[PDB]
Design an enzyme around this catalytic site. Structure first.
Site, PDB file in Angstrom:
ATOM      1  N   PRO A   1       6.623 -13.452   2.204  1.00  0.00           N
ATOM      2  CA  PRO A   1       6.857 -12.085   1.983  1.00  0.00           C
ATOM      3  C   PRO A   1       6.091 -11.107   2.477  1.00  0.00           C
ATOM      4  CG  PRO A   1       6.898 -13.572  -0.270  1.00  0.00           C
ATOM      5  CD  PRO A   1       6.671 -14.357   0.805  1.00  0.00           C
ATOM      6  N   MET A   2       6.169 -10.170   3.282  1.00  0.00           N
ATOM      7  CA  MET A   2       4.865  -9.483   4.059  1.00  0.00           C
ATOM      8  C   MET A   2       4.358  -8.626   3.042  1.00  0.00           C
ATOM      9  SD  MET A   2       3.852  -6.969   5.346  1.00  0.00           S
ATOM     10  CE  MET A   2       4.107  -5.437   4.474  1.00  0.00           C
ATOM     11  N   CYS A   3       4.397  -8.651   1.811  1.00  0.00           N
ATOM     12  CA  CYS A   3       3.283  -8.146   0.755  1.00  0.00           C
ATOM     13  C   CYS A   3       2.324  -9.190   0.308  1.00  0.00           C
ATOM     14  CB  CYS A   3       4.328  -7.399  -0.857  1.00  0.00           C
ATOM     15  SG  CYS A   3       5.381  -5.839  -0.535  1.00  0.00           S
ATOM     16  N   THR A   4       2.675 -10.361   0.342  1.00  0.00           N
ATOM     17  CA  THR A   4       1.580 -11.313  -0.221  1.00  0.00           C
ATOM     18  C   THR A   4       0.315 -11.408   1.073  1.00  0.00           C
ATOM     19  OG1 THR A   4       3.433 -12.620  -0.982  1.00  0.00           O
ATOM     20  CG2 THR A   4       2.038 -13.469  -0.517  1.00  0.00           C
TER      21      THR A   4
ATOM     22  N   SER B   1      -1.812  -8.461   1.445  1.00  0.00           N
ATOM     23  CA  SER B   1      -2.513  -8.671   0.385  1.00  0.00           C
ATOM     24  C   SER B   1      -2.242  -8.888  -0.755  1.00  0.00           C
ATOM     25  CB  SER B   1      -3.377  -7.119   0.378  1.00  0.00           C
ATOM     26  OG  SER B   1      -2.534  -6.242   0.139  1.00  0.00           O
TER      27      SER B   1
END
Ligand SMILES: *NS(=O)(=O)OC[C@@H]1C[C@@H](n2ccc3c(N[C@H]4CCc5ccccc54)ncnc32)C[C@@H]1O
Ligand SMILES: [Zn+2]
Lengths: 79, 527, 429
Positions: C203-206, C209
């Protein structure tokens, strides 16, 4: 009610028994395997009588009866 | 240092496996197509060194099916020729050859074989096979007998006992102990209060914590056992489902950490168990009865049994690893470390049971390193011991596994039939000094003669199974051919069993493999 | 050919036997016919490639071709046995045919230093069997499509002589598989597309950051911190081969990891995560390439009944193989005859169609282009591959009725995964 005892052969030939019903979605069969063996369902690929078993369909519409043997299978990307 | 060269495999058996590999010495008997294919697959990864015993001249047909013989080899010794070509594959590998034959070796220098890590014999006749297997059994040297005959591929492994620690299982249930939590874990859980949490702090709590929290509430609200039947775990998912924080409008939020917890109710109420495989290891005479001779493995096996009585309240050490989940860095890291440290502590605890047995054994308590103890503690659930019946046992009239053969012959086209044909072919050979249907002149009457040999073999061992005549016909058809692609297949299959023996990593097959190029099907038997 | 040479092959051609394909005729001139005239194309001169080439040459094949676009790397050397370290930086096909033609007398291995895309149908049409030991999925999808496009259906029914058997091997660690595909007869690559494991991506969020694993840190540096800082000159792409680039990411990942308290960032894991490296040994490759070879021989010679479809191999725990007959999908977007059926509202945007085309676990296209006959000319609704046109058309991602499309209309879809024009029939709702 039905209490079907099917088997699943893993990628190593290990055979496991699962209790299911004709109404049980393929999803759940994968969960039964994970519960015994730790194989994440997302990685499972089940094959019965040649057919690739869709998560959303059920045991009944693959005509999976009593002593049936499912086979976990894989396709390998590298060469 | 070009370790870039072995990169792709270093990712499989690591530096410690690679070192084990680079210091092994493998003996190959007969440098036929089967032989050099097995060998090609050990030279490439960088086997330490190799010796090819072979007392034959390169025949015309030998140069035909071998990648490591040439047209120019015809007339020259097969061992020497094969080695010259195989060495060109990898200059980090030391080759050797011996012009004396296997039978000659055994008559004049049986001890010659005590210098090898593994002996891989190929295409041996029945008598030589039985002499070699016997010597090596008493010499305790790991033997692998391989054979390509027509489209049939066959290999027998023979190690009296082969204990493995790092078994590399493809999958296993995670060791989370939520069902029987360790004191240091309970501390971390109680440092979590669900109801009184911030915005992001709720949607970033690892699912393990989440399930634990609700497992308290359930244990509370049931004043008794935790969720066990499928009906129960469904309700437990629902009780979790409640915890999802709603919003201004009135809708539950998309907190995936909770969705994951709902998914994982399936596995993570496991019941923390000692695998019944490890149960068999503990109850084995070689663990129960420590002596001064006992090897490094069984010491450690006892250093785990004793942990099961004392420090472990009835269970194995903590694995110390955790699957990836949905959580913020700190909350994950802190959770990882509670697992990590308890293990680093249960290991050091096993390492104390190590010295307490080395007292009775009368050896220095540092012979087994903290790098070895980690692996044994990590893989405490994954230990395997493979023991092999000797060949004499298999070939014994009063020790043959009839039950296994007959049982398997139920399907008359079960791989076992190919083995029976091999045994028929082998006694054809020793009656006749030659294999069946080698020459076009001999195919017709050999079907006759081979059926007779089969009948006699099945009679000798009191085996009442029926073999389709099509098999006798087909085995004569073969005419002792050694088709390359059959032998290539065996070469791969076999080479990796040998790498298994060498590195003590992975799990060797148990006993008898049969590959059938006809159907492209294979099978393992314990003969 | 010297006395004895082919004695290991001859028995299977000259002699009859109970287990032969019903079409088998024993002859003493089947072999010479094979050596002289059976054209076989090997795809990929890699791990699997080298082994296939060996296997066919020693199996009595002689008119062999190879395609491979890659060049020789130092890490090839643990299995790609046709290459010696003094060959590093040379084209695989070149070296592979050079080795073979010297080691196996009279062998006519013909090297093509080329992408498979470079060739069109004219080329592939000429071969009797095509075996490939390919790298990835996308390229297996391409060759699958190319061979299906060769098929000639004369008014509903299929000319069998226009079928070109495809044998596909694949390998990964100690697991491997092999396939016999008969385009338009048995299950093709796309029929069994969902058989590949999940191509795990984070996931691009993980990555952005919330790292919890060392891999996430290297990925952070890969897609985020490399574009942000452009450290090796602005407008210089990350080269996964270059030891300086890899070095840079490695240090930059130990920073990020040490910050979030993450042990596990090694030079090896970095090189893996970046290149998405498949763990490979010679033994597994050998096993698979042998199966394929055996089957090519079987098909070309009719000496036995070909493998009916699929074989999986696993080496980790003893030895296991499972063989089965993969069912052809009646609806398959690749090998089945009649257009796909898609159902959309007349007020669906067009973006909605593309999203369906990209994401559907049965379609799985990566950069599709939609085309339809609106008014007189063929009109490009939207195309992605040439940025000239992925700009002239970008607006069109808002409408379907507004675009001029009618219930019943067929749209022409093109994508890099396949050289075929995939046909969809639109249904309004
Ligand atoms: N398994 S291995 O030994 O590590 O590697 C084998 C590969 C085969 C060969 N190879 C890979 C891909 C090739 C292509 N076309 C690919 C490029 C990307 C793409 C997109 C769409 C369609 C096709 C393709 N052509 C030729 N050779 C290729 C290199 C390496 O040895
Ligand atoms: Zn298809």
């Amino acid at each position: 009610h039905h209490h079907m005892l099917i088997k699943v052969k893993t990628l190593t030939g290990k055979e496991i028994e699962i209790d299911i019903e004709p109404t049980d979605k393929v999803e759940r069969i994968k969960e039964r395997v994970e519960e015994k063996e730790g194989i994440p369902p997302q990685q499972q690929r089940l094959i019965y009588s040649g057919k690739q078993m869709n998560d959303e369909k059920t045991a009944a519409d693959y005509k999976i009866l009593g002593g049936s043997v499912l086979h976990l299978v894989l396709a390998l990307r590298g060469g | 240092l070009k370790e870039q060269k072995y990169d792709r495999q270093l990712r499989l058996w690591g530096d410690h496996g690679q070192e084990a590999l680079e210091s092994a010495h493998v003996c190959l008997i007969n440098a036929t197509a089967t032989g050099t294919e097995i060998l090609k697959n050990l030279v490439l990864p960088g086997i330490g060194s190799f010796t090819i015993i072979d007392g034959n001249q390169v025949s015309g047909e030998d140069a035909g099916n071998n990648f490591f013989l040439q047209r120019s080899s015809i007339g020259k010794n097969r061992a020497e020729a094969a080695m010259e070509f195989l060495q060109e594959l990898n200059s980090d590998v030391s080759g050797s050859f011996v012009e004396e034959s296997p039978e000659n070796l055994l008559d004049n220098d049986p001890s010659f074989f005590c210098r090898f890590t593994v002996v891989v014999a190929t295409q041996l006749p029945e008598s030589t096979s039985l002499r070699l297997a016997d010597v090596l059994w008493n010499s305790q040297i790991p033997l692998l007998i391989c054979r390509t005959y027509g489209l049939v591929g066959y290999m027998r492994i023979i190690i009296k006992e082969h204990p493995v620690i790092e078994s590399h299982p493809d999958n296993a249930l995670e060791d989370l102990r939520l069902d029987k939590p360790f004191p240091e874990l309970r501390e971390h859980f109680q440092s979590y209060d669900l109801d009184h949490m911030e915005k992001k702090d709720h949607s970033h709590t690892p699912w393990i914590v989440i399930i634990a929290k609700y497992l308290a509430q359930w244990y509370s609200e049931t004043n008794g056992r935790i969720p066990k039947t499928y009906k129960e775990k469904e309700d437990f998912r629902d009780l979790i489902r409640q915890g999802i924080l709603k919003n201004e409008n009135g809708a539950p939020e998309d907190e995936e950490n909770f969705e994951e917890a709902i998914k994982n109710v399936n596995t993570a109420l496991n019941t923390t168990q000692i695998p019944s495989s490890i149960e068999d290891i503990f109850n084995d005479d070689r663990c129960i009865n420590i002596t001064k001779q006992t090897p490094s493995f069984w010491i450690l096996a006892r250093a785990l049994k004793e942990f099961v009585a004392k420090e472990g309240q009835g269970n194995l050490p903590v694995r110390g690893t955790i699957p990836d989940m949905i959580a913020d860095s700190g909350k994950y890291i802190k959770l990882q470390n509670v697992y990590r440290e308890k293990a680093k502590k249960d290991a050091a605890a096993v390492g104390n049971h190590v010295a307490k047995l080395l007292q009775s054994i009368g050896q220095a308590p540092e012979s087994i390193s903290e790098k070895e103890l980690k692996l044994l503690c990590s893989n405490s659930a994954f230990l395997r011991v493979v023991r092999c019946r000797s060949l004499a046992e298999e070939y014994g009239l009063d020790t043959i596994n009839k039950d296994e053969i007959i049982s398997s012959m139920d399907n008359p086209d079960n791989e076992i039939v190919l083995y029976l044909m091999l045994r028929a072919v082998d006694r054809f050979h020793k009656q006749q000094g030659r294999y069946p249907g080698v020459s076009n002149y001999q195919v017709e009457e050999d079907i006759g003669k081979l059926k007779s040999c089969l009948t006699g073999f099945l009679q000798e061992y009191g085996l009442s199974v029926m073999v389709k005549d099509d098999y006798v016909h087909e085995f004569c058809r073969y005419g002792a051919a050694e088709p390359h692609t059959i032998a290539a297949f065996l070469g791969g299959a076999a080479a990796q069993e040998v790498i298994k023996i060498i590195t003590k990593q992975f799990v060797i097959f148990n006993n008898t493999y049969i590959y059938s190029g006809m159907s492209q099907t294979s099978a393992t038997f314990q003969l | 050919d010297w006395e004895g040479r082919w004695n290991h092959v001859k028995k299977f051609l000259e002699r009859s036997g109970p287990f032969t394909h019903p079409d088998f005729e024993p002859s003493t001139e089947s072999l010479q016919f094979l050596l002289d005239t059976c054209k076989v194309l090997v795809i990929g001169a890699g791990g699997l490639g080298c082994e296939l080439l060996k296997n066919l040459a020693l199996s009595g094949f002689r008119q062999i071709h190879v395609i491979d676009m890659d060049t020789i790397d130092v890490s090839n050397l643990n299995r790609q046995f046709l290459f010696r370290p003094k060959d590093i930086g040379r084209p695989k096909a070149e070296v592979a045919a050079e080795f073979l033609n010297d080691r196996v007398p009279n062998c006519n291995v013909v090297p093509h230093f080329n992408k498979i895309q470079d060739f069109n149908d004219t080329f592939y049409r000429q071969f009797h069997i095509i075996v490939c030991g390919l790298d990835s999925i996308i390229a297996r999808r391409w060759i699958n499509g190319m061979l299906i496009s060769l098929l000639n259906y004369e008014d509903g029914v299929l000319d069998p002589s226009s079928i070109v058997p495809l044998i596909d091997g694949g390998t990964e660690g100690f697991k491997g598989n092999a396939r016999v595909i008969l385009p338009g007869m048995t299950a093709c690559i796309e029929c069994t597309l969902e058989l590949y494991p999940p191509q795990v991506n984070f996931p691009m969020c993980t990555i952005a950051s919330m790292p919890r694993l060392p891999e996430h840190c290297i990925e952070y540096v890969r897609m985020l911190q490399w574009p942000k800082e452009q450290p090796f000159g602005e407008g210089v792409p990350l080269d996964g081969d270059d030891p300086e680039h890899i070095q840079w990411i490695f240090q930059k990942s130990l920073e990020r990891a040490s910050q979030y308290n993450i042990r596990g960032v090694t030079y090896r894991l970095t090189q893996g995560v970046v290149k998405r490296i498949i763990p490979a040994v010679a033994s597994t490759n050998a096993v698979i390439a042998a199966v394929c070879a055996t089957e090519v021989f079987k098909i070309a010679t009719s000496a036995y009944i070909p493998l009916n479809n699929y074989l999986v191999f696993n080496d980790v725990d003893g030895l296991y193989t499972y063989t089965f007959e993969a069912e052809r999908k009646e609806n398959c977007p690749a090998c089945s005859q009649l257009p796909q059926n898609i159902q959309f509202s007349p007020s669906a945007k067009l973006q909605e169609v593309l999203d369906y085309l990209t994401n559907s676990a049965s379609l799985q296209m990566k950069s599709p282009a939609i085309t339809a006959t609106l008014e007189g000319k063929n009109r490009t609704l939207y195309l992605q591959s040439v940025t000239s046109i992925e700009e002239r058309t970008r607006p069109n991602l808002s409408k379907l009725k507004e675009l001029g499309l009618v219930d019943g209309q067929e749209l022409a879809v093109a994508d890099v995964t396949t050289p075929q024009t995939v046909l969809f029939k639109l249904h309004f709702t």
